[PDB]
Amino acid sequence: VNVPKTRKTYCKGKTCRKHTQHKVTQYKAGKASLFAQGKRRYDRKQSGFGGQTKPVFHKKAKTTKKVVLRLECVKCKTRAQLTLKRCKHFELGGEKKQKGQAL
Amino acid sequence: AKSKNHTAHNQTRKAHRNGIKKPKTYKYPSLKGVDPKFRRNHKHALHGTAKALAAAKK
Amino acid sequence: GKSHGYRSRTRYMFQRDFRKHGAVHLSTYLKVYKVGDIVDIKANGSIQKGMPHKFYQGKTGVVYNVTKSSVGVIINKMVGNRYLEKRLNLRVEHIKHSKCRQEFLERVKANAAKRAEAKAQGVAVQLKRQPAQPRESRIVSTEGNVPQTLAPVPYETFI
Amino acid sequence: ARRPARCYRYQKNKPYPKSRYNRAVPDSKIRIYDLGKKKATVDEFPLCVHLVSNELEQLSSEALEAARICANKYMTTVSGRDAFHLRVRVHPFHVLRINKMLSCAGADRLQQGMRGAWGKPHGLAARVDIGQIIFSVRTKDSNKDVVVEGLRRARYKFPGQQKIILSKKWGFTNLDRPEYLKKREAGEVKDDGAFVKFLSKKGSLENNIREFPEYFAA
Amino acid sequence: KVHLVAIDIFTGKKLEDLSPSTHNMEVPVVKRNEYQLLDIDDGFLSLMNMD
RNA sequence: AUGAAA
RNA sequence: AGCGCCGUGGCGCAGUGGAAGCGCGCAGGGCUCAUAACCCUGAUGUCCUCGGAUCGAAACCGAGCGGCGCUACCA
RNA sequence: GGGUCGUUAGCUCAGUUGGUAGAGCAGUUGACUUUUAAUCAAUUGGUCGCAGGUUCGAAUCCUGCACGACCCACCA
RNA sequence: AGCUGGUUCCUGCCGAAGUUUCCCUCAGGAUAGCAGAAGCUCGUAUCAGUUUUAUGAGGUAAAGCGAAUGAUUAGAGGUUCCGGGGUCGAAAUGACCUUGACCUAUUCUCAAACUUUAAAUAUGUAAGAAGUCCUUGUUACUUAAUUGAACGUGGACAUUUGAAUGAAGAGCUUUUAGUGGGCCAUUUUUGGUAAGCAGAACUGGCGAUGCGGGAUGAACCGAACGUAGAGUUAAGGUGCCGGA
RNA sequence: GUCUAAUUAAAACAUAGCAUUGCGAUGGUCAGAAAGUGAUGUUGACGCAAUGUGAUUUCUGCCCAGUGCUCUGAAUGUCAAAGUGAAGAAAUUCAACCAAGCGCGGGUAAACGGCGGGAGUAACUAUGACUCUCUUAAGGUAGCCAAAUGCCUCGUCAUCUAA
RNA sequence: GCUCAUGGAGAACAGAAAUCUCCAGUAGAACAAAAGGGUAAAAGCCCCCUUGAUUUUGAUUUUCAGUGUGAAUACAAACCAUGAAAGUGUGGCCUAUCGAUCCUUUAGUCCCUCGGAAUUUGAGGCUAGAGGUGCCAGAAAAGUUACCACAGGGAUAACUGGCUUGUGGCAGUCAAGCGUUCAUAGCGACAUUGCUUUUUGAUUCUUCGAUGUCGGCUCUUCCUAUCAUACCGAAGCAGAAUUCGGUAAGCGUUGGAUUGUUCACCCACUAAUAGGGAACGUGAGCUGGGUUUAGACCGUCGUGAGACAGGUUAGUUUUACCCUAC
RNA sequence: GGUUGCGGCCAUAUCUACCAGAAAGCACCGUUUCCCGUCCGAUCAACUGUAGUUAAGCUGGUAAGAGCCUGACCGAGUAGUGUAGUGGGUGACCAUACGCGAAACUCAGGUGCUGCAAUCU
Ligand SMILES: C[C@@H]1C[C@@H]([C@H](O)CC2CC(=O)NC(=O)C2)C(=O)[C@@H](C)C1
Ligand SMILES: [Zn+2]
């Protein structure tokens, strides 16, 4: 699959509230902070004797993730997310699909 | 040790005991699902006609 | 696996027709629909938008709502032990009127005409329908119409 | 080395024909459907005799085959290969399934039984009813008792109560004798290699006169 | 349960394992690709594609 | 490296 | 009986949708008195058969045929 | 005791799934040689174990019929 | 302990389910259904396991295949710039003969996953008062438009207020038990050689149900139960056992 | 010689003998809650500890790729805490560094254990010393057998038998 | 804006198949795929412009508890595209292509809180999405036990019994042929109708708070589909010997070798050495070879504990005095 | 009645082969500067309505026409099917009673009708 690098879409930014041009980029899940309450509770919960205390997941089936975008309005920078289907191969650098060509 | 997978036996006796009551139909039904444009105009029109009838008999 | 889809066991049902494939004629669109109108439901498989479910194929309902290219319809549906009201946002290609209701309205205005004539003369309308009552005596003649005696036929193989 | 026809006799189950779904069958042993002088003509063989059924059953290609051979053997023995035309009138398209178990003592440990009941093909069969003719023949009255002897033998090979009938018809037509004869001393007929083409009162007079000329030259 | 023996391929090293026949075992998405050959510098294979 | 029988 | 694998040159064994690799064997030439080995050369593969999909298959999915393998326990 | 496979030139082996038996070995003759051997060429041989349908018509379609080659055959 | 076993007096009234969905769920539960009890609003109807009239929808039976798709038998008559070839001959889109193709109309047989057609039975809806007609009020909706739409004012339209029949009261809620192993018969029907086999569809029954007949029997036929009496019958029978 | 007392006394265990492994006392093996504790040990490699095999005779083949055991460290691999540095107002973050071990590379089979298929060919035919090829860490060597191991199998030949 | 597949007729190279042109062409093509519907100035092919695959949240349908998830339908308020315009457009022509809580993370609000008052980091919140549970309404998870235990189970197996009888076995119909000649003395292929329950399956009704489980020995009784014996008929019966068939189950049907054996195979006698049933007769009648616990050996399988209707060896066989029958 | 435009139902309207066509109207047709699109003024855009022709299109008629449609006192009350039966039969199956009721075939007929507006001897 392929997508362009810029897209005309609504920007609910409180002065646009209309279609502006949006630079697209991917969404990366973001590095995890320590000192978040789950991690703190987890370090305490695993602290000491008792062994593993929370489950841990292995029964994996999905060979794909949903791909997700960030849409930065060029004027307001009101970012925005919107999600797409599942794709094995993904690409933003789009060499267009020229129909009238050979093999 | 297999089992009986499915059957509709006796369900209609069970239903027709105290069964298939028609839904109570009512005057002045729900104006949900109705075109909201029409809902809105209908509101304002009823306000107008209530005012008019009260002014005809005040 | 067991397969139960929106358009399952529907092949011959949304088969359009013989010698009627392609587009739709225009009275389907020029017809009119109002609240309280009773309507029939047959589905045009050539119009894959606004369709009903095969349950509602060949059924009947009442209008409650009207929009650009579509109409609201109420139906009653047996679910276990009760009839449930079900609301459909259908397309007029799948809608049509109920001529039963049309003829009922015509009977109504004719009944009113009879009541008017009987207000004019006091002449005992008897408005109500009545069944095919049993028939009355008569005398059938025989002239040019003598009874031909008939009797059974023997067994012939007919091969 | 086959299973009994009593096991595969009645129409217990719907028609399972050859198709793009089965795709894989054991071909018949019968392949012939016409015997004798099939290139004979209509007035050549006026008499037509039948063999019908009073059951509603399935008939195997093997019985069809053996009965074909018995009747044709009798006829081609006594009255020669070119004194008659025999025609079978039921084609076996149906197919017969078998859940092949084992024929050992010790299959207990691996049989698994009725899990996997859907059987594979192991033959064919026909499907007949009351009056649906099984065999027909066209010949002359001199050859009559010869051919009905043949049909007697074929009865003895097929199961059930099958009947023989001497038709009121001229050859394999759906036409009766005197109507054929008035037509044929008239000119509405035009012989094919075996069968005949008739004159319609409908359509192109030009084609009719291109054909059937004597009828116009009444 | 299944005894499995497979050769690690970038090394040439045998790998023997065993695990029940019904448990899930991982597979990669390996694919081979042809490539042309150009003037070889130090060990980097000097290759190219049609485009 | 081998080289048929008299 | 159920399930799984495999059918590539004369032989053996590789082969990955844009289209067959290697060795040994074969042939020709040269050296040799002659054959070997040796040096220079060339060729050979309905890719088990049918059908299908594909713009196009040895490959990819059915049909069949064959050579094998695995199953076969508690009684 | 059955289920399968096959029984082709004097020998062996393809055979063609339907109309013609082909290859090899062997033998006879020829070439070769001082004569032989091997090597080259050529003919010889074929109902393919007994009857059926019969493709017009049949070894090979397959029905049975005598030879063999395999796989199977209480039970707790 | 989701498993086995046992679970103490009488009578009266009503009276089941073994099915749906989810559960490491399949010997169990939750949920909905089935059933009881408490009643509540009203007082003969906003109903009916029903028919008729009218109107629709279905694509199963049956039928057809000289109608589509697919399969299929046999002939004939043709086109060979036309597949194979045999011949005349040097050959010639030259001539002839034969043979598989293709074309033509004809013929025999078929289809759960083919069909023009197309039932029976089952199934939806309407048969009025919350209605019909006339007039004009409203609106930010709609219209080119005091045009339409929706809801209304006022008035008129009665006894036949809009077919039949019946209604034993109609409607409404709350709460809760037990159950969630099901089986037999007719008819349709899938698997299977077939099965007192396995499995679905409709209805009725057994379970939970005795009585009379089938000698005998869970289910069949007849008929369903307070205690008694009198008569008459059912199904089945009337030689004797055995009432006739 | 010993065992399953109260269903198995045997081919099982043991045994002598063979072989291997660890250990030089600041130790090996083992114990113990610990301890100024302990067994071997009132001992010292012809010894203590742990294994296998099982008299004598003869003989012990090929495989260190796998799994284990073990020896390297010469290494930009990985690399915890403590510790160091930078940033920051600090929490804190990032970076570097990096023990053993793992990884890397060697050894080891009287350690666990393993020890292949396919074609063609000889002047009768059959067979195949021979040759070719795929592949393995290497392909079962000496020797032994339908033996307590051999499905097919009541294997084929002989003998014992009238069978 | 065009109209596809295919066929026919032409055009050098060029042929069956290269590109071009004309005629027919109701779809016999194509629409990402599975299959089915649907579609011919289109939904197919080409061309032009675009990003409605957007935002707000609600309603509705399907599965259905009228819960969720998923998918879809029709609208309102916005912002947009395309077009001359009507109009169409909230992903793919329709039918499938997917995922809760806690946690983590990102976007929005730049809003709330950090509870003695403030600022700033940081943390925690609200709205909306993702990271994934495929056992797909979603636990975090390898084996063995013949040393075994327990609660139960005839809802569920292994014997017997029962229905069924494919298969096993037995008997018929018909008669191409064989039989020197001749279908039937005797056999009788291809086809077909039945029977039996002595096999083996299939099923799981009874039986899991136990019906003592192969064989032999012993011993009786029964069926006949009669091996022999009695009487008879037919013959390709000269005689002898033999074969087929009828009434017939009265009477009899062995000894041994090997094997646990049923069975089989041999030896020999024999008048003949027929088949079967009785809970696959019979264990308070035997035995205990075998099978069938625990010990042990081999082989193969397994990393291993351990497995093998694979082989071998060793391994407790209880009570009748009651009723009935006798 | 004819013709044109916009049409409803979408074959009685289609298809094939021929025959005819007053007027008028359509159409064929003539031209390329202009907007416009094409490999090409062939298609499409624009101009004149002049040059000319009703040959073709278009309209209608013919065809023992193919096809379509309708009807049958044709087939057929058949096939199938609902309900009942201590009905028959070994069974497959069938008949009877109360009921519903096809298709194919056979024969006969028909071959577009019609709305709004404008126009033509
Ligand atoms: C699988 C991984 C984690 C998973 C989640 O943490 C799993 C469990 C955590 C737990 O212990 N109890 C729960 O309620 C859910 C989740 O949300 C997924 C998207 C991503
Ligand atoms: Zn913005």
How many angstroms does the Cα of residue A87 sit away from the middle of ligand 2?
A: 28
The identity of residue D75, as a single letter, is: M
Give residues 1 to 58 of B whose Cβ lies within 8 Å of C. 14-15, 18-23, 29, 33-35, 38
How far CA A98 is from CA of A60, A91, C45, D6, E31, in Å, comes to 38, 16, 35, 68, 26
Check: CB of residue D57 under 8 Å from CB of residue D160: yes
Whether B33 sits inside 8 A of C81 (CB atoms) is no
Instruction: Give the Cα-Cα-Cα angle D112, D117, D121 (nearest 5 degrees).
Output: 125
Report CA Rg, chain B.
Answer: 25
d(CA D27, CA A12): 73
Check: CB of residue D51 under 8 Å from CB of residue D135: yes
d(CA C122, CA D74): 95
Contacting residues for C95 by C-beta, under 8 A, at least 6 apart:
C31, C33, C39, C40, C41, C71, C73
- Expressed in percent and rounded to 5, the helix, strand and coil fractions of chain E are 0, 35, 65
Check: CB of residue C47 under 8 Å from CB of residue C94: yes
Q: What is the DSSP letter of B41?
A: H
Look up tokens 């129909």; give the residue.
A99
Check: CB of residue D195 under 8 Å from CB of residue D172: yes
d(CA A71, CA C12): 47
Q: What are phi and psi of D74, to 5 degrees?
A: -55, -50
Check: CB of residue A74 under 8 Å from CB of residue A21: yes
- Give yes or no for residue A93 CB within 6 A of ligand 1: no
Look up tokens 């009813």; give the residue.
D129
Subunits adjacent to chain E (3 or more Cβ pairs under 8 Å): none
Check: CB of residue D71 under 8 Å from CB of residue D139: no
Encoded tokens for B17: 């005991």
- DSSP per-residue codes, chain D: -PPPTTTT-B--S---B-STTT------S----EEE-TT--TTTS-EEEEEEESS-B---HHHHHHHHHHHHHHHHHHT-TTS-EEEE-----EEEEE-----SS--TTT--TTTT--PEEEEEE--B-SS--SEEEEE-GGGHHHHHHHHHHHHHHSSS-EEEEE-SBSTTSSSBHHHHHHHHHTTSEEE-SSSEEE--SSS-HHHHHHS-HHHHT-
Which residues on neighbouring strands pair with residue D169, listed in sequence order? D176
d(CA D8, CA D19): 21
Q: Is A45 helix (H, G, I), strand (E, B) or coil?
A: helix
Check: CB of residue E4 under 8 Å from CB of residue E19: yes
Give the count of beta carbons closer than 10 Å to the beta carbon of residue D154.
26
Instruction: Give the Cα-Cα-Cα angle A5, A11, A15 (nearest 5 degrees).
Output: 135
Residue D95: how many CA atoms within 13 Å on its side-chain side? 17
- DSSP per-residue codes, chain C: -----TTSS-HHHH---SS--S---SHHHH----TT-EEEE---TT--SS---TTTTTEEEEEEEE-SSEEEEEEEEEETTEEEEEEEEEETTTEEE-HHHHHHHHHHHHHHHHHHHHHHH------S----PPPPP-----TT-PPPP----------
Q: Which ligand neighbours the alpha carbon of A71 most closely?
A: 2
Check: CB of residue E21 under 8 Å from CB of residue E1: yes
Q: Identify the burial level of C19 via C-beta atoms within 10 angstroms of its C-beta, where 0-12 means exposed, 13-18 middle and 19 or more buried.
A: exposed
Which residues on neighbouring strands pair with residue A72, listed in sequence order? A23
d(CA C65, CA A66): 39
How far CA B26 is from CA of A97, B31, C62, in Å, comes to 60, 12, 14
From A57, A58, A60, the mutation candidate for ligand 1 (largest count of ligand atoms within 8 A of CB) is: A57
Chain D interface includes C159 (CB < 8 A): yes
Chain C interface includes D138 (CB < 8 A): no
Resolution in A: 3.1
d(CA C89, CA C53): 11
Q: After which residues is chain A broken (C to N over 2.5 A)?
A: none
Q: Is E36 helix (H, G, I), strand (E, B) or coil?
A: strand
Check: CB of residue A42 under 8 Å from CB of residue A54: yes
d(CA D104, CA D110): 11
Q: How far is C83 from chain B (nearest CA, A)?
A: 6
The identity of residue D177, as a single letter, is: R
Q: What is the DSSP letter of A31?
A: P
For residue C159, list chain D residues with Cβ-Cβ distance below 8 A: 50, 131, 165, 167-169
- Torsion of the alpha carbons at D54, D55, D56 and D60, rounded to the nearest 10: -110
How far CA D109 is from CA of A16, D98, D102, D113, D116, in Å, comes to 78, 21, 11, 11, 16
Encoded tokens for C133: 């009552």
Nearest to C66 by CA among B27, B28, B36, B40: B36
Max Cα-Cα span within chain A: 68
Check: CB of residue D35 under 8 Å from CB of residue D65: no
How many angstroms does the Cα of residue C128 sit away from the middle of ligand 1?
A: 72
- Give yes or no for residue A55 CB within 6 A of ligand 1: yes
Report CA Rg, chain A.
Answer: 21
Chain B interface includes C35 (CB < 8 A): no
How far CA D27 is from CA of A13, D24, D33, D59, in Å, comes to 76, 9, 15, 15
Contacting residues for A14 by C-beta, under 8 A, at least 6 apart:
A76, A78
Check: CB of residue C2 under 8 Å from CB of residue C21: no
Nearest to D151 by CA among D60, D58, D88: D88
- From the CA of A57, give the closest atom in ligand 1: 1
Whether C65 sits inside 8 A of B34 (CB atoms) is yes
d(CA A45, CA A42): 5
Instruction: Give the Cα-Cα-Cα angle A75, A81, A86 (nearest 5 degrees).
Output: 140
Is there contact between D24 and strand H, defined as CB under 7 Å from any strand atom? no
d(CA A9, CA D156): 86
Nearest to B16 by CA among C78, A23, D54: C78
d(CA C14, CA C29): 20
Contacting residues for A11 by C-beta, under 8 A, at least 6 apart:
A17, A18, A19, A20, A22, A71, A73, A75, A76, A78, A80
* Cα C68 to chain centroid, rounded: 26
How far CA C23 is from CA of C26, C31, D97, D142, in Å, comes to 10, 17, 46, 67
Whether D169 sits inside 8 A of C159 (CB atoms) is yes
The identity of residue D18, as a single letter, is: K
Nearest to A7 by CA among A17, A16, A20, A18: A20
Residue D16: how many CA atoms within 13 Å on its side-chain side? 20
